[PDB]
DNA sequence: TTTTTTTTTTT
């Protein structure tokens, strides 16, 4: 009823942040400075400020958003007149809607209401253009008149042509004029419900969402998103009714978020502890007893090294880990934990994957019969982590497809007239069993591993797990029963905090190698080669890749403590962990 | 509103270039010599000469080009009246527009503006004809009238037939008259964004462009081009509404550049150095330590020999290189560098390619129902370099598809009623691993290589790389760490100018064989054949192909120094490099 | 039916 434009403007200029620093005033000039033409607000803050305004947004969304858009636009023009003639419309987006509904629980009662859905992005289409105001010319020898067809109204989702010329009142031919037509960016995406939300024995459901204007290209497939907007029915093929008054539903996205200053203080506070490295390792798979050297290795792969890009070549910065062990050694359980804690990870099984599905697949589009590309698991994991369980179960002729993606971090396809190259910069963690299921100490190491030396040299670290019963059985049994009894280990960083810590470290820390670290690494690498040549029978080869493994591991150790330099202490830790890897495969040092 | 035709004419007639030769009057001078009806003007030159004139082209391109082009036509007629009755309209193409937009960043605000896009050409269609002014006959026994349908306007993108006869005002049926219709050449192409600008975890995007009149057949697939023109929305089936008022965008090309005299003297200056060959070799893969003999071999393949075309046959002039080595010997890094410095190169892997994708594929169009050919990797690489990494991972029944393309440089297809023969004159560089991952010195060369003798004989040079940990580890380790520390080797030819040097040499240099070079090559071949008879178990056969390899290598060495003939020094170098090849495969002379 | 790359059952 009443106008809240005065309230909205006053709220923007008078709201107080956590430190009462007016967390909203400094967003306005940032909008003006960068001409971002999109401003977001929090529903909790609006409700905390004025209860009446929050309800009107949450209920009368379709008749108040343009009103607040006009009021905000006027406030921008007075603040900076130069904003005019560059941006003709500014959008305000509301987040944190209390109306959250599961994807499977949407009913007809929720149509037309501002709701929020949490799911997984699966498909994204290229950006296109949608007409919201057309212009036609009446092709009738008497008219030759141009007019905007939808009068005082946006063009509906169905493209409708005028039947009677408004300028002359007669029918005839109408020709669209693209020059005078107004367009808006338009993208279509598909969202899927989370695996933990799917009911027993059923496939996950999917919903179609539409992103327009500045919301296009807001996320990539495989992301976890929270989308807010209005639901509506979909009219796709109305040319022929064919009975079937049944319709699907789709969502007009108003605000989207993927997956902060307070968190940064928490992250930096953690790094102040001298024993942060040991504290982080203790937080990796808290439900698994022992395997301290494995948890340390897995922690390094989460942080990785520093990729180097030069004018003529680039160097891999990711760390690859291979684990071989007897059944029941908690290999799969540890790998599942990595998927949860990594900011971006893809979990695959060796038997349930193919060569085309891992890198890229060439498929024939049924509508046109033309071949095109589909991204594989490694491509979708670019910048993240790829987990391959049961690597020994894959066919050897099929496993070689990942050799290029594991060192050059690229995928090359030359099939059916398609030549393409794709980036696959991801870290690979793989697990498997020995050749005879269990490790046989009588036989050498070569026949136990049963893998070609080419793939073995690609892995920075290799650990062989032996399940040897001994005095430690009682400790293991007590630990497992405590887990089943609900007792939880304390003094460990929670998974949510740990994920934020890793994401921050991988984005703002780039350690550099000092002179002291160079001498230690060089001496140790020379020592490997001399020792390796003494026993030319092991299946492990000390190639120059091993030298680069030491550099990557050293940078990861420094990056774990948010250090900008690789001191001698990190080099010693990198050398020490490499020693345990060599002792595992029976290479003494 | 000021008349710019006078400004244009004085700009063309009076302009000073960097060389001080009035660059812009020679182009129009050659315009009438060859009747090319197209003039190229740089945006930097017009802006410097007249800032106001340059701006008017940028923002008023729609209604300034016909006036600007019309003014140029009158000037040409004054220069030579003979241009009349040969060319009706002359097009002016503007390049160097500062408005450069990435392919993924195009939004609605860029529609109708002159922009420039850099990308890769992937698809070209055959040249067709487009109607811009039709002629119709009213089939109604009283009319028998001819009229150009679109009055004072060209035919739009969508063909439209008149509904009311302009000659009588009555409806009816109208018949097109092809002989009185005005046509224009039309071609469609697809541009793909470069792999550098593709975001993480996303597939590359594509844009459709239209070439008309003299711009047709101005490029070939795989080229890197810059296109300037106007964006517009694409209409395909406007008659069928089918809801979904969402359109795709295409581009009307106004000028195209495919990726000068100052380079000629720069290249000539480089060739004057007596040690130019060493400088070129030292500039191949600067980030790789050692492997001097492999760097020399890769340099030869970039330049290549001299193809011979005779009345009854032709002789291959390309050089093929095969490298077999232990894992971690930087084989893939060098191949990556070659794919960047080569003016035209295609990079493929053994596992990610098929027989059809390498040579040619037969694809059926579901619309018409007929079969047609699709160019493979080797066909697209004609006149350039083809890189096939991990060649040993190819299926043997699939690898044999390149036997004829490597020697006869042709692709023969007899499939689905299609018999064809395509040129595949491309050099092949391949790498792979021995049978057991690493070379075993305790076993003969026969079972280490694991490749048929038919394909081995087709390679001019074969190098077996052994990773022997010796006393050079410290030097190798220090070099690698220096690379990781940002240190760069100095006194090398950078990749950009090195690419220009190779392109110039392969185009203007055709060395000849002298009498003294013939004697050295003949004597060496006799000894090579005699020595091979000692060991017949080796899978390396000295065939007459090896004699022609010596000729090709000798020509390549001369081509490096831009020499016009092959002297005894070039023959000696060819013998020396051939000797190292034989020693590696176990033939000692 | 036909060539092609893909997952699938069945020749
Ligand atoms: Mg398991
Ligand atoms: Mg390699
Ligand atoms: Zn009208
Ligand atoms: Zn008529």
Residue numbers in the entry:
A (entry chain C), B (entry chain B): 7 to 265, 275 to 604
Original authors' sentences:
This ring performs a helicase function to separate the two complementary DNA strands to be replicated and drives the replication machinery along the DNA. The helicase/ATPase rings of eukaryotes and archaea consist of six minichromosome maintenance (MCM) proteins. The MCM rings of archaeal organisms, such as Saccharolobus solfataricus, form a homohexameric ring.
The first class of structure is well-structured throughout and binds a very well-ordered segment of 11 nucleotides of ssDNA within the central channel at the ATPase tier.
